[PDB]
């Protein structure tokens, strides 16, 4: 379903845009329903949960007699749901704002996060918006730049910081948005070096053999060294075997 919004550069410039979900993990539409083994009927089974205290007598506590809490070190601090909603971070939903512009070399692919890719086109039946979006895309492509932007699906959606980069094709041109990591999402792990390791240094024969192996197992073939490459094993066109 199309997602309408406005790409805003500051408080004076606004371009109407529509976003679609291009690539995402696909799951089964129909789930497994638990049925009674004998009668084979759904309505013959009922799942429920109960809460009991940790005392020896195993007292019974109702769902209205419990609250939500968190852990703060070695102690536990109560934090009710209403209090959390009152103290919750509140933001204005449906925001697509350009925080800034940065060189493409500074946004690495390995830092991409999330579970979606968004394709942003101009608003349907809108010539001015299309012209503005085309101008922005062409400028970004010419300058080799990407836009660091803030994205929020709706009011009750956590804000995200992502990167939008141009994608120009002979048929259509559009922006491609992918989420980017926060400060808390980065892991700082140190690994030993391999080049400088004395006991893990391959010899000339090993390197030659590995080169031969790589050459023999090529999955792309040049078209008689004339125009371009051709893919022997395209994995994008293979249907998911799980559903099959």
């Amino acid at each position: 379903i199309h997602w309408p919004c406005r790409l805003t550069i500051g408080s004076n410039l606004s371009i109407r845009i529509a976003a679609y979900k291009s690539i995402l993990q696909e799951r089964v539409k129909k789930t497994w329903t638990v049925v009674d083994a004998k009668t084979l009927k759904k309505e013959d089974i009922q799942k429920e949960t109960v809460y009991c205290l940790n005392d020896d007598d195993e007292t019974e506590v109702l769902k209205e007699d419990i609250i939500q809490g968190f852990r703060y070190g070695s102690d536990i601090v109560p934090f009710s749901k209403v209090d959390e909603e009152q103290m919750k971070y509140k933001s204005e939903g449906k925001c697509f704002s350009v925080l800034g512009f940065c060189k493409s070399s500074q946004v690495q692919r390995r830092f991409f996060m999330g579970n979606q890719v968004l394709k942003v086109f101009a608003a349907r039946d809108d010539e001015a918006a299309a012209v503005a979006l085309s101008s922005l895309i062409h400028a970004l492509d010419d300058l080799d730049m990407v836009a660091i932007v803030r994205y929020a699906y709706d009011k009750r959606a956590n804000p995200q910081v992502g990167v939008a980069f141009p994608h120009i094709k002979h048929n259509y041109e559009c922006l491609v948005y992918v989420q980017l990591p926060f400060m808390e999402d980065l892991r700082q792990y140190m690994f030993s070096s391999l080049k400088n390791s004395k006991k893990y240094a391959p010899t000339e024969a090993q390197l030659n053999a590995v080169d031969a192996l790589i050459d023999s197992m090529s999955l792309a073939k040049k078209d008689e060294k004339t125009d371009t490459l051709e893919d022997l094993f395209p994995t994008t066109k293979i249907p998911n075997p799980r559903f099959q």
Partner: peptide, 24 residues
């Protein structure tokens, strides 16, 4: 090792977030 944090040894000290700062 240079840059090691003084609170959690063995982890790189993270520079404070500066957000967006436009260049000259």
């Amino acid at each position: 090792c240079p840059g090691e944090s003084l609170i959690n040894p063995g982890f790189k000290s993270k520079k404070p977030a500066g957000g967006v700062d436009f260049d000259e």
